[PDB]
Amino acid sequence: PQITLWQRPIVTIKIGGQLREALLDTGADDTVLEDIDLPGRWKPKLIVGIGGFVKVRQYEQVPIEIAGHKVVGTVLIGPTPSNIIGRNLMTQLGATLNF
Amino acid sequence: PQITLWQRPIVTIKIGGQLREALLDTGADDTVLEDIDLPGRWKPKLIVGIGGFVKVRQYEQVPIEIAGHKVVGTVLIGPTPSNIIGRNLMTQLGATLNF
Ligand SMILES: CC(C)CN(C[C@@H](O)[C@H](Cc1ccccc1)NC(=O)O[C@H]1CO[C@H]2OCC[C@H]21)S(=O)(=O)c1ccc(N)cc1
């Protein structure tokens, strides 16, 4: 799809058998979700956003469906005021910005 | 232009006679710059953000050139780890996300 930016670019995701929404975020290097259970091993990571800092769990090689497209990559779990799909996974969709 | 997202989508901006770079950020509702003097009146705002809160100055009807395109809108000034161009101004460029 093509979408314009008059509203937030929110898409449906499926991860670990649960359905959520997330914002396609070209300003985010990494994908960060809050409201989700992932199984298995993970590593502590701190990420830095406008408001300071947030401490996250890094899950590697996570299967995720984004607007219908299956991909695998890194997902960070931690407090974020909005679930975010970052460029790590947008590149897998061949996403572009156009103007 | 069309750009891909393997690298951060950074563009050149000109504002208030000052040249800067900024990230094109579809996850940001508003444009937020740190490293910049604007003249005139402004209002306090809190914007929220991944690691919490930031206190910003809101400047209205600010002339800004983004990748060569002249627009006017709202610019927030305050601490941000990265200058970001939000949807308030990308809609003025007719920007779209495509996949
Ligand atoms: C500030 C950016 C360089 C970085 N961020 C992405 C950014 O798109 C966030 C993404 C975002 C979105 C909603 C809430 C928190 C963070 N948007 C944001 O801070 O925008 C603010 C300015 O406009 C307002 O509208 C949204 C909040 C305000 S971030 O959230 O800090 C971030 C940083 C690193 C990663 N991996 C993922 C996210």
Side-chain angles (χ1 to χ4, degrees):
Chain A
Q2 183 176 74
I3 56 162
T4 64
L5 301 168
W6 298 98
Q7 44 215 351
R8 292 180 184 144
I10 294 168
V11 293
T12 312
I13 71 168
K14 186 180 167 183
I15 183 181
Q18 290 195 94
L19 301 174
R20 299 292 189 270
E21 295 185 276
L23 167 79
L24 289 171
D25 187 354
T26 62
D29 297 337
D30 313 301
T31 297
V32 187
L33 311 177
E34 175 189 71
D35 47 9
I36 317 292
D37 296 334
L38 288 180
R41 289 214 134 97
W42 53 271
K43 311 194 270 254
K45 206 197 155 163
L46 184 60
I47 59 168
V48 67
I50 36 159
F53 57 42
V54 66
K55 302 171 174 283
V56 297
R57 312 177 170 193
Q58 180 181 295
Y59 302 78
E60 293 170 295
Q61 283 214 251
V62 181
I64 180 171
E65 166 201 313
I66 304 167
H69 297 75
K70 289 172 267 154
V71 300
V72 174
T74 308
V75 178
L76 307 180
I77 307 288
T80 172
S82 176
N83 287 338
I84 293 297
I85 305 305
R87 301 186 289 98
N88 79 297
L89 303 187
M90 294 195 281
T91 51
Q92 303 306 119
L93 306 174
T96 60
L97 276 169
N98 290 143
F99 62 93
Chain B
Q2 182 172 258
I3 53 167
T4 63
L5 299 167
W6 297 101
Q7 51 216 150
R8 293 180 183 145
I10 296 164
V11 292
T12 311
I13 72 170
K14 185 179 174 287
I15 181 179
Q18 302 163 88
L19 302 175
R20 303 289 189 271
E21 294 186 278
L23 178 71
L24 292 172
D25 188 353
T26 62
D29 296 337
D30 310 304
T31 298
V32 186
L33 310 178
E34 172 246 304
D35 44 10
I36 284 288
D37 300 337
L38 289 183
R41 274 151 69 74
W42 48 274
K43 312 207 76 226
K45 258 192 64 165
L46 293 99
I47 63 170
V48 68
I50 212 172
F53 73 113
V54 194
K55 204 155 59 99
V56 299
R57 305 175 168 192
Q58 181 183 87
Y59 299 78
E60 298 170 320
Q61 281 228 72
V62 180
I64 178 173
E65 169 201 300
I66 301 167
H69 299 75
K70 294 178 282 172
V71 303
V72 173
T74 306
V75 179
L76 308 180
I77 308 289
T80 174
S82 285
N83 286 339
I84 56 171
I85 303 307
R87 304 186 288 99
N88 79 296
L89 301 185
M90 284 182 58
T91 53
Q92 305 302 303
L93 310 177
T96 60
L97 276 171
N98 306 253
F99 70 87

